[PDB]
Amino acid sequence: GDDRELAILATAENLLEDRPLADISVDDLAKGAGISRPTFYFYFPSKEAVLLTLLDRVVNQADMALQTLAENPADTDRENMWRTGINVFFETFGSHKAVTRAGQAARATSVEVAELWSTFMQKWIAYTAAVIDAERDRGAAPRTLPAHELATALNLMNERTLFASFAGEQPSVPEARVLDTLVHIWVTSIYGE
Amino acid sequence: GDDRELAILATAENLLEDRPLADISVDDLAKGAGISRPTFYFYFPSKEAVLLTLLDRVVNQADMALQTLAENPADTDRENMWRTGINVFFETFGSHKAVTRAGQAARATSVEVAELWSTFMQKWIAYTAAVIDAERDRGAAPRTLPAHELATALNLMNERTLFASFAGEQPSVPEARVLDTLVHIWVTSIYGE
Ligand SMILES: CCCCCCCCNC(=O)N1CCC(C)CC1
Ligand SMILES: CCCCCCCCNC(=O)N1CCC(C)CC1
Secondary structure (H helix, E strand, O other): OHHHHHHHHHHHHHHHOOOOHHHOOHHHHHHHHOOOHHHHHHHOOOHHHHHHHHHHHHHHHHHHHHHHHHHOOOOOOHHHHHHHHHHHHHHHHHOOHHHHHHHHHHOOOOHHHHHHHHHHHHHHHHHHHHHHHHHHHOOOOOOOOOHHHHHHHHHHHHHHHHHHHHOOOOOOOOHHHHHHHHHHHHHHHHHOO | OHHHHHHHHHHHHHHHOOOOHHHOOHHHHHHHHOOOHHHHHHHOOOHHHHHHHHHHHHHHHHHHHHHHHHHOOOOOOHHHHHHHHHHHHHHHHHOOHHHHHHHHHHOOOOHHHHHHHHHHHHHHHHHHHHHHHHHHHOOOOOOOOOHHHHHHHHHHHHHHHHHHHHOOOOOOOOHHHHHHHHHHHHHHHHHOO
């Protein structure tokens, strides 16, 4: 039950590497998972539900890694503190580029995908603002913009910029340059007057 | 000829304020422009072509305003120089929110929309990098990140963040706060070490 489900999810992630969800039939999913079409429909209502589950897994993997870091601070300067946090997103979404691409496309057509993405962006922005607020309270960062507004723009930059790098968009920052680029902008905008 | 074309474009921009392009028939466009369906097809091949033309107009309005500013520098500090430039995009796209929303949706399904947006983002990034390079050459900005990579991330931040504000997304920076938020991040990241 868990095993046919994981086989369907694994098949979908593999097929998304080579074509969009629109070009994957539920027949393709059932065939890769070694089940029939009706048996598929027992585990998922639709191929869209399979993508929602894949995206939910990736988003929660990033969130749990951020929670781990939040509990287990690295012993490092402020630049490295922010770099390690942005790296959670770089590594987690960068390790699942096909699901990342497909999920972003699904935001336009799926209220459940849009709501999942909104929920976690709100969480990550709130955490970012709490860290900025802590840095200001300790005297390490200046009281410039409203922390939640700064956090929002920085998180949206990372969403757009990581996505463009992963998707090979024109324009994009090269993938081998994107982490340093984002870290610079975060550190200067958080600590700068 | 120019006048029936402008009537079709005006009808489309008005109807996009209240519903997506998928919910606008070519009958609706012809009716608002005071022409028949076949007469529509004389001026545009499709409703998608009408949106491409609307987006082309808005993008070139922003580009021409940036060209005007590039030729007619304001007599102001570095913060105001960048604020005036970001404001071109805030005002131009903010004055055409329905076309902005519809154009962004069309990038997923229209190679011509995607290519139009890419072409102008490349232009605006190249201009941004040239200004950063000039600021470094004059000794006003430090030689930190590769200017074209910094420019790319900043332009992508503005694309995503302005869009979220205009579209009322959750999350977003309030529209009345977005210009100050972006200016801060640009100035600190360009001038900061
Ligand atoms: C391609 C999809 C990528 C989506 C990335 C969206 C989140 C970006 N947010 C961050 O990078 N964070 C927030 C938390 C702080 C502590 C570290 C930095
Ligand atoms: C909702 C669609 C918005 C899209 C905005 C895309 C462009 C953002 N770029 C800028 O803001 N610029 C670039 C040029 C310099 C000199 C000023 C700042």
